[PDB]
From Swiss-Prot:
Main location group: secreted
Source superkingdom: Eukaryota
Tissue spec. comment: Pancreas.
Alphabetized UniProt keyword annotations: Disulfide bond, Endonuclease, Glycation, Glycoprotein, Hydrolase, Lyase, Nuclease, Secreted, Signal
Enzyme Commission code: 4.6.1.18
Residues of the full protein shown: 27 to 150 of 150
Reaction catalysis annotation: an [RNA] containing cytidine + H2O = an [RNA]-3'-cytidine-3'-phosphate + a 5'-hydroxy-ribonucleotide-3'-[RNA]; an [RNA] containing uridine + H2O = an [RNA]-3'-uridine-3'-phosphate + a 5'-hydroxy-ribonucleotide-3'-[RNA]
Organism taxonomic ancestry: Eukaryota, Metazoa, Chordata, Craniata, Vertebrata
UniProt KW Disulfide bond keyword: yes
List of residues binding substrate: 8, 11, 42-46, 67, 86
Disulfide bonding pattern of the chain: 27-85, 41-96, 59-111, 66-73
Protein name: Ribonuclease pancreatic
Species: Bos taurus (Bovine)
């Protein structure tokens, strides 16, 4: 099989199946099930609770600078339901542990391809 950059973005950052984090253990479960903690704990990761179509649409919205200075980033006009997963103080690989926090923010993504879709999650603002 093959995984594209766009598909990896979906695996790492999309969860359209819920309107918001579904439990206090959501991040522990998702960071594991989406294979985001294989070799080390990832300190922060955001999941977006919106339709794929609505997130892909961001690539036709507000062009902004990525934090690294690249100019292929785009900010959403809409405010989106997101979950931020962040390591707790006691998290220690291979037993990675996360606090699940709900938010409603704009997202900033990097985009590529035809169709022109997200390949990178840059920030929420
Ligand atoms: O609000 C944020 C900021 C960063 N990241 C993620 O944290 C990592 C380092 O910045 C990135 O993961 P990556 O290298 O696989 O693309 C980025 O997507 C988030 O998930 N949410």
């Amino acid at each position: 099989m093959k995984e594209t950059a766009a598909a990896k973005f979906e695996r790492q950052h999309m969860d359209s199946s819920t309107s918001a984090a579904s439990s206090s253990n959501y991040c522990n479960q998702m960071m594991k099930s989406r294979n985001l903690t294989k070799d080390r704990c990832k300190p922060v990761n955001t999941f977006v609770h919106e339709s794929l179509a609505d997130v892909q649409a961001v690539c036709s919205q507000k062009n902004v600078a990525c934090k690294n200075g690249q100019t292929n980033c785009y900010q959403s006009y809409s405010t989106m339901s997101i979950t931020d997963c962040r390591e707790t103080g006691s998290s220690k690989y291979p037993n990675c542990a996360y606090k699940t926090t709900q938010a409603n923010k704009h997202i900033i993504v990097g985009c590529e391809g035809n169709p022109y879709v997200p390949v990178h999650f840059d920030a929420s603002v």
